[PDB]
Design a binder for this molecule. Structure first.
Ligand code: HEM
Length: 291
């Protein structure tokens, strides 16, 4: 497969800035969801799940085709809980019917990180909706009950190296795990709807204890009332992942710069950009616009 990016006909930077402003205004408005965490965390989880199905070997999956709109992908057990981010963006897609699904789903993640005081993520337009028979089969997304070798091996399918994996996982400071969606329960830190380097500081400074939860799954719990998944805790058990974790705990600006590059790469995997294509867009936040 080749998936060549095609710009939505006649659209420019200012058109996309209006879809970004509509998502960001609705993030401001619907601030009560999930005990006042708001929709920012579930929207970056949605952008990572529609992108994490990619396979480098045959170019199938990935954000291009916007195939999470189909029932097979939508009802994947690993996507339980994302129906909420879908329902959030759905009025916005009726307001801007020209935007493709892969572009809206991925831009939702970019808008959420920037509006939660995260780094600026450059974003490129041009994903094209593809037919229901291009929808990936279930089972390409990662398990949480595993170790650092599984994590390393998993992310090699999306050719992410060690530093990209540790930067990307820092998004687990956002939102929380929910027992009815995944069989895990609890948040990763205190500031879970502001983007910071908190995940790394917690993983290095909390007294973590291994316990089984009410779904019979193991997780690491701390005195503070925080939790870590087996795959998260992995990052301090592997010597190569641990030096990068220490680096981001001591330097939030390095973390923001690396998360920015790795997240854009994740959202563009599997897509060919022609060089007549527009350069990546950097969107202004509401605050920068006075809105
Ligand atoms: C080995 C990789 C990963 C595993 C096993 C994993 C697993 C999980 C699980 C089990 C949840 C909880 C879902 C729920 O109960 O609602 C979760 C939440 C979340 N994940 Fe991941 N994750 C991984 C990687 C990532 C990456 C790379 C990102 C983003 C760049 C990410 C972003 C999020 C976010 C923001 C949440 C919170 C969602 C919410 O509050 O509803 N995850 N993760």
């Amino acid at each position: 497969l080749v998936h060549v990016a095609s710009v939505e006909k006649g659209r420019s930077y200012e058109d996309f800035q209006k879809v970004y402003n509509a998502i960001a205004l609705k993030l401001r408005e619907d601030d009560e969801y999930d005990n006042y965490i708001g929709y920012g965390p579930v929207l970056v989880r949605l952008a990572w799940h529609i992108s994490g199905t990619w396979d480098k070997h045959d170019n199938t999956g990935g954000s291009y085709g916007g195939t999470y709109r189909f029932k097979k992908e939508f009802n994947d057990p690993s996507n339980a809980g994302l129906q909420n981010g879908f329902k959030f963006l759905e009025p916005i897609h009726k307001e801007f019917p020209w935007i493709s699904s892969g572009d809206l789903f991925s831009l939702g993640g970019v808008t959420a990180v920037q509006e939660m005081q995260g780094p600026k993520i450059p974003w490129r337009c041009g994903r094209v909706d593809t037919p229901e028979d291009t929808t990936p089969d279930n089972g390409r997304l990662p398990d949480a009950d595993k170790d650092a070798g599984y994590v390393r091996t998993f992310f090699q399918r999306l050719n992410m190296n060690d530093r990209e994996v540790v930067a990307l996982m820092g998004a687990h400071a956002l939102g929380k795990t929910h027992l009815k969606n995944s069989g895990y329960e609890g948040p990763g830190g205190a500031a879970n709807n502001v983007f910071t380097n908190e995940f790394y500081l917690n993983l290095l400074n909390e007294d973590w204890k291994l316990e089984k939860n009410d779904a019979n799954n193991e997780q690491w719990d701390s005195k503070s009332g925080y939790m870590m998944l087996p795959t998260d805790y992995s990052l301090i058990q592997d010597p190569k992942y641990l030096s990068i974790v220490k680096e981001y705990a001591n330097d939030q600006d390095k973390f923001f710069k690396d998360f920015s590059k790795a997240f854009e790469k994740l959202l563009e995997d599997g897509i060919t950009f022609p060089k007549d294509a527009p350069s990546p867009f950097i969107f202004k936040t509401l605050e920068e616009q006075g809105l």
